[PDB]
């Protein structure tokens, strides 16, 4: 994977000694080239993960996330061009360095071989985002935002470290290939429950899970837009990639202690989706929407069925493209109106034709029209959960109905209706943010044509 | 300010007869019933002491409150009508014209020429009207939303632009 | 109370400004001024046929318009669907499955020439 790693780190010298105006052009073009090179990673064998090196390996689960990160990186590059114009060149290059460093840690995380190496770069993503959230934020609270996001993830991260090093002393290795191949049943000894626990809350705190999610509304609604997408699109999914990994050994414990988190989640998305319907800030809805969508994933991983894992993977990638779009969409409105209140700028279809479309299928992908990959992930979860328990259907079915309730609500309360006559600064929609939405949406329908590439290794 | 005694009955009499024609439907039937209630309205036109008319108010307003049709005829442009707030999806604020690419402005040259002088007309008018409104307003601010006239020389009516440049009721 | 000396000319002033505004909100004779339509001389070579005024001259063009509709929207389709399913789709097993027609005891099979024997006399309960 150094055919991706080496060019990615080579973006640092190139972006750090380019001209004072070419930093945006240079970073965007070669990051896209990295995305094209990363597209070759879509190739997967029947069941053998691509073992490029001793310390790097990939399969049908890592690559779709890998392409998601690499494809994403130019998207914040173009999104940040708007509000980063009024800055010095050296600080601007510092911003680009954080994004590239964030990307580089992401690729190493997904391509990691053993759990400890995965853990190091996994957590290492906290540092670049911590600077992004805090240094370049917009409001006073961002200082409290960073601490909330940092400690929450760390509070669960440290128990996993103790459990991980404990794995090495007991099993003899932490390599994922050996762990799955040398998998042994886990006893129900009272120590083993905490052993199971210490490998879980690390992944579910950043999912986020119901209860342990408050950093999500306190960061995504408050981070800079560029940091907002990568947080929602991929960073939450870091728990997903880990959980499919760590569950290979933590069996058959999952049968019992999934329950306290299952209905914690099962009552979760319905509860969270209710909060989304009754927000006042724009970005607060999508943030609360993200945990709601992430909640069905938690059930998908934990239930441990092949169908749910495919549904987990599809919903994971689909939500990333979606949540990035709505966060980008909110940023476009926030920039002109200098706020994020929902009913502040209702009724803008008459002035924003193309935006009103970009609202339209972005919300529809949030409603998950058929046959968008959102349903393909969502429906697979439903069938797996129903096979587990019939009474499941009412809950998340009601959730995706209250999900439908709000997912038109901002469409009504941002585009439908009459403009505000005192507002007179909604200028012609610039092609930059405009083309940004195009690059968000077309891969969604393109992947809809051939979804078979994003169901993970269980397909 | 407060709704005067004979003003409140005029409001109640208004929709009560609209309720009547909603009930009667037929024009002649409405005409017969409207005149009957006209004399009924005139039965105690005298009130003398205001306390009597307040009691007469209560019975009267209670009559027309129950006098509503279950589905009264709300006109298409009436509040809640079929055509009410229908074409708001077409009207766009006048400032959007300034946010036009020069090609579109050039291909509508005469209109933007007269829009420019209208934009100019807004300038001196706004200048004159604000230094007209500040002293026309007595201490304690404006006692009511009524706004003073252009009673000076060569002066435009203060606070006129959005009223004059209102989105025309038929934007098409 | 009509209006007040304040309201009277106030409404009059805004009305005339609104009146002249609506005059400016009209479309002047030179409005709109449009740019040239870049178009090959090929369609004008048959659309001046319709302007000749003869009964043939314009109905046949409408029939021609129906004809160009058929080729570029119906006729070239029926080719590429037919090319699609009878060489690529039918080349796969069970891609298209047709139900057995209701073969009659009394009727015959075309390929084998076998007439399926019919049943005997009906009750013939003529009303």
């Amino acid at each position: 994977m150094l055919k991706i790693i080496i060019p990615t780190t080579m973006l640092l010298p190139m972006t750090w000694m380019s001209k004072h105006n070419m930093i945006w052009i240079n970073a965007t073009v070669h990051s896209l080239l990295i995305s094209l090179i990363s597209l070759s990673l879509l190739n997967q064998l029947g069941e053998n993960s691509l073992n490029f090196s001793l310390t790097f390996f990939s399969d049908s689960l890592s690559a779709p996330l890998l392409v998601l990160t690499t494809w994403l990186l130019p998207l914040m590059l173009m999104a940040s061009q708007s509000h980063l114009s009024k800055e010095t060149t050296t600080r601007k290059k510092l911003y680009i360095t954080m994004l590239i460093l964030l990307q580089l840690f992401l690729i190493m995380t997904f391509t990691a071989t053993e759990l400890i190496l995965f853990y190091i770069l996994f957590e290492a993503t906290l540092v670049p985002t911590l600077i992004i959230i805090t240094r370049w934020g917009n409001q006073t609270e961002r200082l409290n935002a960073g601490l909330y996001f940092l400690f929450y993830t760390l509070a669960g991260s440290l128990p996993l470290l103790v459990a991980l090093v404990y794995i090495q002393n007991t099993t003899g290795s932490l390599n994922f290939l050996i762990i799955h191949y040398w998998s042994h049943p886990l006893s129900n000894s009272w120590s083993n429950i905490f052993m199971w626990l210490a490998c879980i809350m690390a992944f579910m705190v950043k999912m986020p899970l119901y209860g342990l999610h408050l950093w999500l509304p306190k960061a995504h609604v408050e981070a800079p837009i560029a940091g907002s997408m990568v947080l929602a699109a991929v960073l939450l999914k870091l728990g997903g990639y880990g959980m499919m990994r760590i569950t290979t050994i933590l069996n058959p414990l999952t049968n019992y202690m999934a329950y306290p988190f299952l209905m914690l989640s099962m009552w979760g998305m319905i509860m969270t989706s209710s909060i989304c319907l009754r927000q006042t800030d724009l970005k607060s809805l999508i943030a609360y929407s993200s945990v709601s969508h992430m909640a069905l994933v938690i059930v998908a991983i934990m239930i441990q069925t092949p169908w749910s894992f495919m549904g987990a993977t599809a919903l994971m990638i689909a939500h990333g493209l979606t949540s990035s779009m709505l966060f980008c969409l909110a940023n476009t409105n926030y920039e002109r109106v200098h706020s994020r209140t929902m009913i502040l700028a209702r009724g803008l279809q008459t002035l924003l034709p193309l935006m009103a479309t970009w609202w339209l299928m972005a919300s529809l992908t949030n409603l998950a029209l058929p046959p968008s990959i959102n349903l393909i992930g969502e429906l697979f979860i439903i069938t797996a959960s129903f096979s587990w328990s019939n009474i499941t259907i009412i809950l998340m079915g009601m959730n995706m109905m209250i999900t439908a309730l709000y997912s038109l609500y901002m469409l009504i309360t941002t585009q439908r209706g009459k403009y505000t006559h005192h507002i007179n600064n909604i200028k012609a929609s610039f092609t930059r943010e405009n083309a940004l939405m195009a690059l968000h949406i077309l891969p969604l329908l393109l992947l809809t044509l051939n979804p078979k590439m994003i169901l993970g290794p269980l397909y | 300010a407060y709704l005067t005694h004979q003003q409140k009955v005029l409001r109640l009499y208004k929709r009560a007869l609209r309720h009547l024609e909603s009930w009667c439907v037929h024009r002649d039937k409405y005409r017969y019933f409207a005149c009957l209630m006209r004399a009924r309205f005139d039965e105690h036109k005298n009130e003398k002491d205001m306390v009597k008319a307040t009691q007469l108010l209560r019975q009267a307003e209670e009559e027309f409150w129950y006098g509503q049709h279950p589905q009264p005829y709300i006109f298409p442009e009436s509040p809640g009508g079929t055509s009410y707030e229908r074409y708001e999806c077409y009207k766009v604020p006048e400032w959007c014209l300034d946010d036009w690419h020069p090609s579109e402005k050039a291909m509508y040259p005469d209109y933007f020429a007269k829009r420019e002088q209208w934009k100019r007309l807004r300038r001196e008018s706004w200048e004159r009207e604000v230094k007209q409104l500040q002293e026309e307003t007595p201490p304690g601010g404006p006692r009511t939303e009524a706004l003073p006239p252009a009673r000076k020389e060569g002066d435009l009516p203060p606070l006129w632009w959005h009223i004059v440049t209102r989105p025309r009721e038929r934007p098409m | 109370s009509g209006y007040t000396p304040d309201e009277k000319l106030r409404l009059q002033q805004l009305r005339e400004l609104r009146r002249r505004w609506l005059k400016d909100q009209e479309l002047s004779p030179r409005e709109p001024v449009l740019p040239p339509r870049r178009v090959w001389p090929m369609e004008q070579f048959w659309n001046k046929f319709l302007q000749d005024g003869a009964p043939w001259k314009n109905v046949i063009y409408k029939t021609y318009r129906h004809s160009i509709f058929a080729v570029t929207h119906v006729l070239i389709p029926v080719w590429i669907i037919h090319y699609y399913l009878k060489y690529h789709v039918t080349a796969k097993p069970y891609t298209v499955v047709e139900r057995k027609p209701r073969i009659f005891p009394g009727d015959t099979i075309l390929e084998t020439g076998e007439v399926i024997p019919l049943m005997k006399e009906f009750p013939d309960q003529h009303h």
Binding site: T350, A428 | D99, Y108, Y111 | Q25, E31
Partner: peptide
Amino acid sequence: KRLFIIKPSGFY
């Protein structure tokens, strides 16, 4: 006659 129709600048 023809009035004036107002629209956002769709050239972009």
